[PDB]
Structure 1
Amino acid sequence: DSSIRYLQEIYNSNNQKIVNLKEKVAQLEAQCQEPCKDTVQIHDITGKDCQDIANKGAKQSGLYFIKPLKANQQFLVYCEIDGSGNGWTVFQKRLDGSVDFKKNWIQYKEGFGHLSPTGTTEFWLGNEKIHLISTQSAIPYALRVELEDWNGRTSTADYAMFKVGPEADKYRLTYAYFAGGDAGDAFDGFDFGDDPSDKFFTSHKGMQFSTWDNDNDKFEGNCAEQDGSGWWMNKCHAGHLNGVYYQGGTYSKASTPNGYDNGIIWATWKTRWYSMKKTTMKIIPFNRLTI
């Protein structure tokens, strides 16, 4: 009458199944040691700028470390390589209006926003960084302003001998001449029609950088505070690439808190009351657009 000992057979079947289960649990532990795979990767190649990196052997556009001559320590940038050997150094980008561009002097000096390998994030590199890249010895830099509206059209604006001054000069925007492009020369000023002095007071050529906490414009009040941005303000602007992102494009005076256009504008291409969908500011050594 052995109804028992049969329970020992299942007990031996259980113990054996518990022993091998612990071995399978130990196998599971080994696969759960890795962290989450980050898509964002920094490339190993470094140099003076994105062009110097492109000369070293870099092919794809992504995130790179650069170190200018007079810079204290290296910093991250987004480089654009088109396959022709050209390496653009992007310092400003606008896409969706996710990043707020109403920032102070220190935030515009050091930089704000985010840097993506795909180039789909909004950022301002920082006035201190742009100055160190642009004012490298001998060869000057060429500024390219890429603009895109909500219809799908694209326009470019080129500027020769692009230079940003030091912090002591309040980061002054200086260039030799307007190289060309279908976007037009908005840094020269625009005749809006409101006053015969519009062309003179909307020019950005030889103008100091201005934020809400640091006023350096040719206006009695504060251009950077009224428009809510950091820009080389005059009285006040014709091109306003760091402005408020208006969804759709067309915005009226009623949408503005002050009563003065503050959207991403470029008077030479579109009207005063039109905000751009995409904006890109990138620089390259001027010898690259030669031969």
Structure 2
Amino acid sequence: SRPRDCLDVLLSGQQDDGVYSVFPTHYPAGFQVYCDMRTDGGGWTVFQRREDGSVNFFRGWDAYRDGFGRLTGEHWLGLKRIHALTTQAAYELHVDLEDFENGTAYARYGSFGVGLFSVDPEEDGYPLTVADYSGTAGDSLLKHSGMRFTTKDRDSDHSENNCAAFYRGAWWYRNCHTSNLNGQYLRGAHASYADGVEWSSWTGWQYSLKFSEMKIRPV
């Protein structure tokens, strides 16, 4: 009837990967998401996908709040939706990564949230909660814990510059990053420093990954 996320969709008997309606506690109008019904038993709600560089990710605050791209392709679900999902239960984060040489890796985080205790999550800059790493990609997100989301037109980072402008992305930048999954789709090894789709613990600071998917499931 009114699944709150992709795990409710799965447990209701929908086993196919694809687009489903979900209805978070404080977003009763609901919205559509892509559900991953396969990874570690399934029930993952996707909020980010890179796969081909068809979508511009070098977007401003309003786009990162409201979301962009298409659920069946490259997209960002929007921080207002990611907030609505991660405040309604205790979520884990799964990050799937792929390079241009057939290689894959993943990072699992036991706890993940955006603006968890923010009275106005947008005003407060949708700050990251993330803890408890495991997997094959190595940890490139724990150092971003407690940071606000920074875009090219809204600087909340710990740099004298705008990290989002400098590294051509949008992220919970500190000074500046170990991960940049909303970075430019530069397609593998690049001369420019850390401004591609980067997961530094796996492929370093000068390798733009082929594929990324960020997704959440209640624990």
Q: Which bin holds the TM-score, normalised by the shorter protein?
A: over 0.9
Q: Is the 8 A contact 2:189 2:207 kept in 1?
A: yes
Q: Is the 8 A contact 1:104 1:211 kept in 2?
A: yes
What is the percentage of aligned positions where both structures have the same residue? 43
CA distance in 2, matches of 1:123, 1:111: 7
Q: Which runs of 5+ in 1 are unaligned?
A: 1-44, 189-202, 254-259, 287-291
Aligned-pair CA distance for 1:59: 1.3
- 2:151 matches 1:151: no
Aligned-pair CA distance for 1:175: 2.0
Q: Which residue of 2 aligns with 1:50?
A: 6
Q: Which residue of 2 aligns with 1:265?
A: 198
CA distance in 1, matches of 2:110, 2:124: 20
Q: Which residue of 2 aligns with 1:182?
A: 136
| Higher deviation after alignment, 221-230 or 121-130 | 221-230
Aligned-pair CA distance for 1:261: 2.1
- 2:71 matches 1:131: no
Over the aligned positions, Cα root-mean-square deviation in angstroms equals: 1.5
Q: 1:169 aligns with which of 99, 112, 124?
A: 124
Q: Which runs of 5+ in 2 are unaligned?
A: 116-120
1:132-175 CA distances to partner (integer Å, 9 max, x unpaired)? 10110xx4101001100001111010111211102232101112
CA distance in 1, matches of 2:189, 2:122: 36
Aligned-pair CA distance for 1:177: 2.2
CA distance in 1, matches of 2:138, 2:55: 27
Decide which structure has greater helix share.
1
Aligned-pair CA distance for 1:250: 0.7
**Paired residues, what number?**
214
Ranked by relative contact order (alpha carbons within 8 Å, sequence separation 6 or more), the top structure is 2
Aligned-pair CA distance for 1:85: 5.3
Q: Which residue of 2 aligns with 1:87?
A: 43
CA distance in 1, matches of 2:124, 2:61: 14
Call closer, same or farther: CA 1:84–1:59 in 2, change over 3 Å.
farther
* TM value normalised by structure 2: 0.93
- Paired residue type of 2:186: Y
Call closer, same or farther: CA 1:211–1:157 in 2, change over 3 Å.
same
CA distance in 1, matches of 2:39, 2:51: 24
